[PDB]
Design a protein around this ligand. Structure first.
Ligand SMILES: COC(=O)N1CCN(Cc2cccc(NC(=O)Nc3ccc(C)nc3)c2F)CC1
Ligand SMILES: COC(=O)N1CCN(Cc2cccc(NC(=O)Nc3ccc(C)nc3)c2F)CC1
Ligand SMILES: Nc1ncnc2c1ncn2[C@@H]1O[C@H](COP(=O)(O)OP(=O)(O)O)[C@@H](O)[C@H]1O
Ligand SMILES: Nc1ncnc2c1ncn2[C@@H]1O[C@H](COP(=O)(O)OP(=O)(O)O)[C@@H](O)[C@H]1O
Ligand code: VO4
Ligand code: VO4
Ligand SMILES: [Mg+2]
Ligand SMILES: [Mg+2]
Lengths: 765, 156, 760, 161
């Protein structure tokens, strides 16, 4: 029964009436098909005529179409309606997958198994499927009794960890706004609730704190993650929650001081200005108007779906639960306020080509909150010190030069404060409790295309490209390698899933990052010397490198990159300065000599592309020493419409994700495998007589069961199971365990009854 | 009737030994040799049988709770029930019982935490009461050697 | 000599045409001349006397009369194959063919041999005239046919691959302790530095400086590297030397304060005490006697093969060339002297309390003076660390004193590496790099502790890196590219042993968890290892005690090692007296103050996995160093010892994948750029694959030696050698025609002058 | 007794013969103005008359002479004319594409340019070596503003001349 799930039950599994309806729905296997459609990818149809190799059918809308025999695809019988695992479908093709997902989504069932991985479609509506009752309902359930859910993936990962004695990872892929952060937080919720049957409280509150400083509204997502993160949840040898840690990657510095038309800066600025805590506005010496602060009011200032006042309470509470002191919280708020004032520092030319301050009010407020001298700050910005050899002299600066430097400093303070907060959360999450394994959760900034794509979009989209290749390598390369290495009869299948050409274009020597890195080491280099080197080395040489596709009215670009998820047009302006990240060292020295301890410590401590590439390669290795579990998030439409599916948009995501190819390797291969010793430990209970040696034991045990003997293979060190065999052996184990406990209880009842009878016999009325 | 088709295979000496045993369960004021439907299983177990709650309810003819508390039964209606229960030999091996308890052994060592076994026995299968578990269990650190425990429950 | 620009090195690199002919015409019969197994020499040469019913009776080279089965007899390679340069070219490839080719080249002092795409080198234990600027000059650009096997040849090929493929390279030098990894690492650097010729001078001097502080005499090597290192040599887009950097890994801290019977501490201590620079002894307030200093005199103090006086001059000069100031050099010498005094500080228990107090102040005074500390503060910090003070017994103070000396030394070594890197960094643009890996090699002592596990685990991981690249990734490459290929299991996989050491519930993991239990003992750690692995993990066994006692055995790739687990918890945690660390931060010596401004197994495992990724993004080139004997005897080969190394290295399996597979591959575009010259008509001036098919099909070559992949053309190494000879000859013919045309132009220019005087 | 030049058929028109006779005469360095050339200045007269033979090809028509024969063995126009006819027969003089592919070997970055000093080195060290004098005369002028040669433009230049 679905009774243990409460109100969530209909949103997780269809009713008994509906499965009786599916079981008795009339169907014509010869008539009921799928045909291509120029606007909907594929449509359902009934064949009218049929022929000479041509089929004439009646569409579900419905029009009359005439297509070739080869273009027609069979529909799965009604028994397969809203199927939980799409690897179990009789006919596996693009519209079978699409229509199974569409039909489950129409019923608000947003999770579907795709063999050993999961597919999830964004509902754009909150459903009652994520509460402690549903967490408890799933605790220990492995498929059959458990409908698809993020809690199921999390639980299955936990069981693999204990059985296989290896570290796990839950890798959540998807475009911007697909649902990666939502699902990441539900994996954490699962493990924290299970542990509560505080570290659990602190693990949950780490994300509201980070999202305030690292998330922002973009054209694609109202709560877009502007940094990547890997959360490791540590466990003891017997599986008890031990500790946690967070690793963050490359925060988008430019958002602090710049916003595009339909974008907001980081949430925190608007959370403070909401006036929910009026004492913060007084402490930071600010008004309640965002249009008064230059760095923060370039794009949008309010979001219909966000209550900045309520979110400020969530942020401030998250810090309290995380054990941040009043000085810690106040120092963070004060530095945020200092950044706000810093942007309002105005400058003018002296008839000379040198900048001087316009006013001093905002500089005074900035310096006061930062524990600096404003006369020193303004002199440092207008006349930075330069070393000749023996003496210290000043450099000249025009307004454009000071404005650039003012921004660079603000971004450096913000990014370092974000880094401090991560380190401070980690100091809390660390328990000194013994660990043996971990379950790692990966939440990257997803694939995105804006009207204007710069360096930050390249870094983001490169990370997404690398993650899809990680799926491709595990599913189609390492998987087939495993069979061969173990002596399983296997013929290699080429799945056509390899993004090495594009990855090589970006990260290998003479690639985009390498050319950029070399150009940064040339003092006379410009954006256009960089644009020329890219063209000279890649146009007509690298297939993924193309000319831009510029349109009048829309912002122009310098080149196109054919990424896995689409072609992105990139603008190369300011990439050298962005990669080098120069800072005014005169002002940095004032920050080091600051009377505000947090600021003093932030600056006490080569290029962005070098560091990004290092973090990515480090990440890819931590993940290679892990058993990965993929969650493929899908955006249903481009208008944030709940329950609405845009067929071409969903199909494009399923294709570039390699969902079908992924299901195929699960169906054709042997997705589950266990060492002979571990097999004996777990499945001897099925028939102890067959195992009174470990390989012969497995051969005797399995051969003694009423199963399809073509569904398992014997390897050098492991038994390999076909898709569906594990699910059967798990049902058979559970039923047999239930029968044995019942017999242990019957025997126990006999003992107790015989004990009391002995008392009666000894003479006791 | 279903009890009427059953053949009494016990020796007259065995019948009388079950008859003498049956007397200790008789709580009737006039000593008319009668037990309630609800105490049948307890007498079956006293006489060496180990039926499940489901098996007892089946020989009783699927009774209601009211029939269990207040419906009476004499030795003549009980004896055919004892014969039927005596026929079942698929009571589970020592190896099945060890394999069942081994599921809860988190490590190698043939031990299980006392509190876990008490929980399993009171929540899974045909649930034992917290009273029955306390009486049965009364452990080393607070762990049970489940292979010894199986030998213990099977000897008793 | 003939085709030698190699000078005096020529006979040590390639034999004369006179020897080539004596070999070729020597007595030999293919039916008689074979190899038979031998219980003492692995295999021996033999001549078949009789053959009956599947049994062969032969005459040994020593010679005895043996009777063996048909299946045990192996064919000798004909005289044409004597001392062959590449063993992948041998007609019969088996264990004695490889062994005897290597033995015969070694007998001629030819220590380098190609093994397909990798190289084998046997330690000569004698310096040969093969590593000079003249030999460097002679290898520059030479192909494997015009260039005899040498470390300069591997280095140059790596350089060519880098420019053609546009990818980073690595030269990975494997071997047991004393095999020759550091020698060959330094010759890779010499090659690139000489080719470029102060960056060149500084790159060469970085190793004498590091070796003084990071190398020491062990029972296996008089100059044993006690740290690992990865040297990256950076190059510009066109291949010009740009910069260099050094990454060092885990220096053996314990050597600073402890030595086993047949061992010395780090070289520097003995270099200073040599009295070659007498002003250092006066500056450091020390005598010339190592037996006066506790920390450094536990084992041996002199090495016959080392002149500590001459080596001190090499160390001091290396620092000068590296641009270290007088304050930088003096601070390093002073801290070395401070460590020497620190070891001589004695303590005793108080009369009525289990609390330590100083037993003398002389060596403490000298230590504090050189360290810019107050000795009253130092002694109070060691006896009463602040928490209000903690109590300390003599055993506790002695341990803490040692831990602080090791921490100063290791951090000073780390500072020196950073300071060398600051010099090696030129702000010159770069595009590629050639990385050189020099690890501390496989070793077995009478007493093996935590430091031997870390060392031998690194060696185990490196052999698996060879196994993965050669037999896994290689076969994977053919499949992903659509080349007809049947998977071969080479029996080269050390995952079981690697899993025993680094995976959850393994040796490192159990140790890490035990460190998080305050009540844990070495014996509680020994119990957990046994409970989880004895009779569960094949590579984990009981110790084989005879002399010092061990707790377990580990079946490593290169042998079974017996490990002693005493003090592993303290070694892994590495606790330090924070009160003394605070005095070092407040030190009047800038160096010590700058130096001090989770576990060893966790950090080691992180460095190893970081290293394996930097290496996975490079094209690797393996150099397999072999120890010939156990007595450091030049020109002497111990057959079982050489064979054991060739086996556990997988040299034969490695040659086989090169022969059977397609070791060379090139993208279609790059193939057109390089080989269109062979026949430009076949590729008129779209489509790059069709172009390659037309070009290759148009040549008088074996068409079974290349295959067309999705993105690349795959070649047999032999076919690549032929195509490179064909390209060079065709380039020589084209230049000759360009010169003939150029001569015609010049002659026509002069004729125009003559004509203008009389006819025009 | 027979000869290899005797079997060669003179296919040039009488007008062509007389044109070649005057060209041969302009190379005269004899003290008596006898209108004869040394064996060593034959290549020059072959090249002046539009041929582009290699040093090896010239030495073959001359009958593999010694250096002494090259410096001092005299030759009349009648012995020269059959040699000019033989050299005129060779058409495998190398294509424009071969010449570009040859110089492309030295293009380190795929520019379509080669460093001046490298081309001067290659031409003076590889194949049938040119003298440092011949290379200076051939290269000037010249390299571009940076000191590089657009090989392919250089090939068009040497083939037009
Ligand atoms: C369907 O329900 C589940 O998800 N589970 C139920 C029971 N499982 C326990 C247990 C049974 C038999 C085999 C697996 N080991 C697994 O096959 N190995 C794994 C390892 C690496 C790769 C790439 N593929 C496969 C083992 F965990 C754990 C989950
Ligand atoms: C002196 O003899 C040589 O070794 N060389 C001759 C010419 N080479 C230039 C060029 C020609 C043809 C193909 C290769 N590329 C190479 O095969 N790919 C390489 C890269 C990945 C891995 C694991 N194995 C194969 C090459 F670079 C450079 C050296
Ligand atoms: N499972 C879900 N239930 C409800 N809303 C969701 C769900 N997944 C996504 N959303 C909505 O979509 C928004 C964007 O999702 P998010 O996890 O931030 O995307 P990503 O991290 O992939 O960019 C969320 O803020 C929420 O409004
Ligand atoms: N190529 C060689 N030429 C001369 N001596 C060598 C050579 N290789 C090794 N040796 C000798 O062997 C010793 C140990 O070599 P080394 O590089 O330190 O070994 P490893 O670093 O593998 O332990 C050297 O000090 C030297 O005496
Ligand atoms: O919207 V995202 O969180 O993918 O950046
Ligand atoms: O002797 V070694 O350099 O291998 O440590
Ligand atoms: Mg997100
Ligand atoms: Mg070494």
């Amino acid at each position: 029964e679905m009774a243990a799930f409460g109100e969530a039950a209909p949103y997780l599994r269809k009713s008994e009436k509906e499965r009786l309806e599916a079981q008795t729905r009339p169907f014509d296997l010869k008539k009921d098909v799928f045909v291509p459609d120029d606007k909907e990818e594929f449509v359902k149809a009934t064949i009218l005529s049929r022929e000479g190799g041509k089929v004439t059918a009646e569409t579900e809308h419905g029009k009359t179409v005439t297509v070739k025999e080869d273009q027609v695809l069979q529909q799965n019988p009604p028994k397969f309606d809203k199927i939980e695992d799409m690897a179990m479908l009789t006919f596996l093709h693009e519209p079978a997958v699409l229509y199974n997902l569409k039909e489950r989504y129409a019923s608000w069932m947003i999770y579907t198994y795709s063999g050993l991985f999961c597919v999830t479609i964004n509902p754009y509506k909150w459903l009652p499927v994520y509460n402690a009752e549903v967490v408890a309902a799933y605790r220990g359930k492995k498929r059959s009794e458990a409908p698809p859910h993020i809690f199921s993936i999390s639980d299955n990962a936990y069981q693999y960890m204990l059985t296989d004695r290896e570290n796990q990872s839950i890798l959540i892929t998807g475009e911007s706004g697909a649902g990666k952060t939502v699902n990441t937080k539900r994996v954490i919720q699962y493990f924290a609730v299970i542990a509560a049957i505080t570290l659990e409280d602190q693990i949950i509150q780490a994300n509201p704190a980070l999202e305030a400083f690292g998330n922002a509204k973009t054209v694609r997502n109202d709560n877009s993650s502007r940094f990547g993160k890997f959360i490791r949840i540590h466990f003891g040898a017997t599986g008890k929650l031990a500790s946690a840690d967070i690793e963050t990657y490359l925060l988008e510095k430019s958002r602090v001081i710049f916003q595009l038309k339909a974008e907001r800066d980081y949430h925190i600025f608007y959370q403070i200005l909401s006036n929910k805590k009026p004492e913060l506005l007084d402490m930071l010496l600010i008004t309640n108007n965002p249009y008064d602060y230059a760095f923060i009011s370039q794009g949008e200032t309010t979001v219909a779906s966000i209550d900045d006042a309520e979110e400020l309470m969530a942020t401030d509470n998250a810090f309290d639960v995380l054990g941040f002191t009043t000085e810690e919280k106040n120092s963070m708020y004060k530095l945020t306020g200092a950044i706000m004032h810093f942007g309002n520092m105005k400058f003018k030319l002296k008839r000379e080509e040198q900048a001087e301050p316009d006013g001093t009010e905002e500089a005074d407020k900035s310096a006061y909150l930062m524990g600096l001298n404003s006369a020193d700050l303004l002199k440092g910005l207008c006349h930075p010190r330069v070393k000749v050899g023996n003496e210290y002299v000043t450099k000249g600066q025009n307004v454009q030069q000071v404005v650039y430097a003012k921004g660079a400093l603000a971004k450096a303070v913000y990014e370092r404060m974000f880094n401090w907060m991560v380190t401070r959360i980690n100091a809390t999450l660390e328990t000194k409790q013994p660990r043996q394994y971990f379950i790692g959760v990966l939440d990257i900034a997803g694939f995105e295309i804006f009207d204007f794509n710069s360096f930050e979009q390249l870094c983001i989209n490169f990370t997404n490209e690398k993650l899809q290749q990680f799926f491709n390598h595990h599913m189609f390369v390492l998987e087939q390698e495993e069979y061969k290495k173990e002596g399983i009869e296997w013929e290699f299948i080429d799945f056509g899933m390899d993004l090495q050409a594009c990855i090589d274009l970006i990260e290998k020597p003479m690639g985009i990052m390498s050319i950029l890195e070399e150009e940064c080491m040339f003092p006379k280099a410009t954006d256009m010397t960089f644009k020329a080197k890219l063209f000279d080395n890649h146009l007509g040489k690298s297939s993924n490198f193309q000319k831009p596709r510029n349109i009048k009215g829309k912002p122009e670009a310098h080149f196109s990159l054919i990424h896995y998820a689409g072609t992105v047009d990139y603008n190369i302006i300011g990439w050298l300065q962005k990669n080098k990240d120069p800072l005014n060292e005169t002002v940095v020295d004032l920050y080091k000599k600051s009377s505000l301890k947090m600021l003093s410590s932030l600056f006490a401590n080569q290029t962005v592309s070098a560091l990004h590439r290092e973090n990515l390669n480090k990440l890819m290795t931590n993940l290679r020493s892990t058993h990965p579990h993929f969650v493929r998030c899908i955006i249903p439409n481009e208008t944030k419409s709940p329950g609405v599916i845009d067929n071409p948009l969903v199909m494009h995501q399923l294709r570039c994700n390699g969902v079908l190819e992924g299901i195929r390797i699960c169906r054709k291969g042997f997705p589950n495998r266990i060492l002979y010793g571990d097999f004996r430990q777990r499945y001897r209970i099925l028939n102890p007589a067959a195992i009174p040696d470990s390989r012969k034991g497995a051969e005797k045990l399995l051969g003694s069961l009423d199963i399809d003997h073509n569904q398992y293979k014997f390897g050098h060190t492991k038994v390999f199971f076909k898709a569906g065999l594990l699910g059967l052996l798990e049902e058979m184990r559970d039923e047999r365990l239930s029968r044995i406990i019942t017999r242990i209880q019957a025997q126990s009842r006999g003992v107790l009854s015989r004990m009391e009878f002995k008392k009666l016999l000894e003479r006791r009325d | 009737f279903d009890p009427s088709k059953i053949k009494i295979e016990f020796t007259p000496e065995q019948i009388e030994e079950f008859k003498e045993a049956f007397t200790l369960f008789d709580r009737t004021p006039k000593c008319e040799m009668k037990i309630t439907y609800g105490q049948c299983g307890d007498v079956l177990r006293a006489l060496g049988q180990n039926p499940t709650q489901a098996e007892v309810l089946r020989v009783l003819g699927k009774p209601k709770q009211e029939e269990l508390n207040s419906k009476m039964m004499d030795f003549d209606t009980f004896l055919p029930m004892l014969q039927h229960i005596s026929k079942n030999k698929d009571t589970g091996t020592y190896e099945d019982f060890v394999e069942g308890l081994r599921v809860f052994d988190k490590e190698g060592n043939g031990t299980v935490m006392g509190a876990e076994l008490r929980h399993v026995l009171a929540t899974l299968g045909e649930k034992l009461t917290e009273d029955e578990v306390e009486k049965l269990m009364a452990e080393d650190n607070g762990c049970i050697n489940y292979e010894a425990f199986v030998k213990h429950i099977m000897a008793g």
